[PDB]
């Protein structure tokens, strides 16, 4: 029986099983080629989604029918405050895959990461690094031995960094530890650069830059138990079918006498880690620079933050990265930014993105003004003024 018709299978079979992620932090699987001819530099960064906004860009794409035209498009804003190194990991190649040799921590750690090691922190005595700190000092030798061991046997060096959550408007107060592979100079150079950065902070403009292409890796929005109709896009039954109509009716044949794994049963939807690539960065922002949302074609001394703040999010107040399109995960969610992972040479990557105007109207509703000054000028003085 050929069923008289051929149709593509509903849903991609590669993204299975559709189960909830084990952690809100989407761990990075693969790092770039790590060519040791370049200077030591980071391979990824941690940021928090801070809603989206619109951008009008004077497209200069040659050959396209939008060449030299003005095109409006969506851009996502991610809060990316500076990151502080708090350790290094030395990895030694083994026949059974890469293995962690040893981990070296910094001289002192902020309460943000100490909190990450406890679940009853307020009840905790806060003994995070009482002895390790004592072991670091009084000889300058114990750590140096670990550094020498890493230099001798390590092959890829990963830097332990965490986000400055206290700087973000989130009430979480807990930082997110992550391992970022070190590219560039030899592993000895990698560890030497990481060692000098102990307890220091790393900005974001030194990793990424305008026109750079990055890959977004984060946990998608959760939706709970979902029917097959929305989980896989199954077509609805005509009407009032017996024992339901919003479900797949036929599950399988008599032979085999078992339900095939690919028949797209209903179950959990969302909250699955996903990876997206080829996302072009439109603007790199700084919290210390006024008029972050300004442009050469706008002249308005206004911040990217929309009037009244973002929806379900506070004010940026820190460095941020502007990226076109949509990024997996909801607002105020930890998202890790990763390089393109390959030597992209498409004209889109080579394109220069010079923003013409940035939308800062309130996202709380049908916003009509970009700044409170415009609203005051339009509406004028009110009763409450006098």
């Amino acid at each position: 029986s050929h069923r008289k018709y051929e149709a593509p299978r509903h849903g991609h079979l590669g993204f299975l099983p559709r189960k909830r992620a084990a952690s809100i932090r989407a761990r990075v699987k693969a790092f770039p080629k790590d060519d040791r001819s370049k200077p030591v530099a980071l391979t990824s960064f941690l940021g928090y989604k801070a809603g989206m906004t619109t951008i009008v860009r004077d497209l200069d794409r040659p050959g396209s029918k939008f060449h030299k035209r003005e095109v409006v498009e969506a851009v996502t804003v991610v809060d990316t405050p500076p990151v502080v190194v708090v350790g290094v990991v030395g990895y030694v190649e083994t026949p059974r895959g890469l293995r962690s040799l040893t981990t070296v921590w910094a001289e002192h750690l902020s309460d943000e990461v100490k909190r990450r090691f406890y679940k009853n922190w307020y009840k905790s005595k806060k003994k995070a690094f009482t002895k390790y700190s004592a072991k670091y000092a009084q000889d300058g030798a114990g750590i140096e031995r670990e550094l020498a061991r890493i230099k001798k046997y390590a092959s890829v060096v990963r830097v332990l960094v965490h986000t400055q959550i206290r700087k973000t408007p989130l009430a979480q107060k807990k930082a997110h530890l992550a391992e970022i592979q070190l590219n560039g100079g030899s592993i000895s150079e990698k560890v030497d650069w990481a060692r000098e950065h102990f307890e220091k902070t790393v900005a974001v403009d030194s990793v990424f830059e305008q026109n750079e292409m990055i890959d977004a890796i984060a946990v998608t929005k959760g939706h709970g138990f979902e029917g097959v109709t929305h989980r896989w896009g199954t077509k609805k039954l005509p009407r009032k079918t017996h024992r339901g109509l919003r479900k797949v009716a036929c599950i399988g044949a008599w032979h085999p006498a078992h339900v095939m794994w690919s028949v797209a049963r209903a179950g959990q939807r969302g909250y699955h880690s996903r990876t997206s690539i080829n996302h072009k960065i439109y603007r790199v922002g700084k919290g210390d620079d006024e008029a972050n949302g300004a442009t050469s074609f706008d002249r308005t001394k206004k911040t990217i933050t929309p009037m009244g703040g973002f929806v379900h999010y506070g004010e940026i107040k820190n460095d941020f990265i502007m990226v076109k399109g949509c990024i997996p995960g909801n607002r105020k969610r930890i998202v890790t930014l990763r390089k393109s992972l390959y030597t992209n040479t498409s004209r889109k990557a080579l394109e220069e993105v010079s923003l013409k105007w940035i939308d800062t109207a309130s996202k709380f509703g049908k916003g009509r003004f970009q700044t409170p000054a415009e609203k005051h000028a339009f509406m004028g003085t009110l009763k409450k003024d006098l």
Partner: protein, 136 residues
């Protein structure tokens, strides 16, 4: 894209599926057009072919001069009447969906076009723009 198109087609909302009635906009004598199929559309299971502004479709005249009835000829949609995304950043829609009849070569049967003509249709079809007294 069929013959007569001088560029790529923008992705716009589907306004007229198969069987949709669109008013005429030329002096050819026809008054309404019945869409039977859409040229350049990739047919898929359960998915009714649908056109949009600037698309070329095959239709049979239902009202107007009887000489044009019962025959199917290519037609170009000049008005969509369904909101579509313009790259200028405006969600614009037309009062009434309308189309014009033309040969596969793109030559307009009518000497002139009446009423507004969509930008995405005039730009893609030089003959429509030349025979259209109004754009947007």
């Amino acid at each position: 894209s069929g013959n007569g198109a001088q560029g790529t087609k923008f992705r716009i909302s589907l306004g007229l599926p198969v069987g949709a009635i669109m008013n005429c906009a030329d002096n050819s004598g026809a008054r309404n057009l019945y869409i039977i199929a859409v040229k350049g559309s990739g047919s898929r299971l359960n998915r009714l072919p649908a056109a949009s502004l600037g698309d070329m479709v095959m239709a049979t005249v239902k009202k107007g001069k009887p000489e044009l009835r019962k025959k199917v000829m290519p037609a170009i949609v000049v008005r969509q009447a369904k909101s579509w995304r313009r790259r200028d950043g405006v969600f614009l829609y037309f009062e009434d969906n309308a189309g014009v009849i033309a040969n596969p070569k793109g030559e307009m049967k009518g000497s002139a076009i009446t009423g507004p003509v969509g930008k995405e249709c005039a730009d893609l079809w030089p003959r429509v723009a030349s025979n259209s007294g109004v754009v947007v």
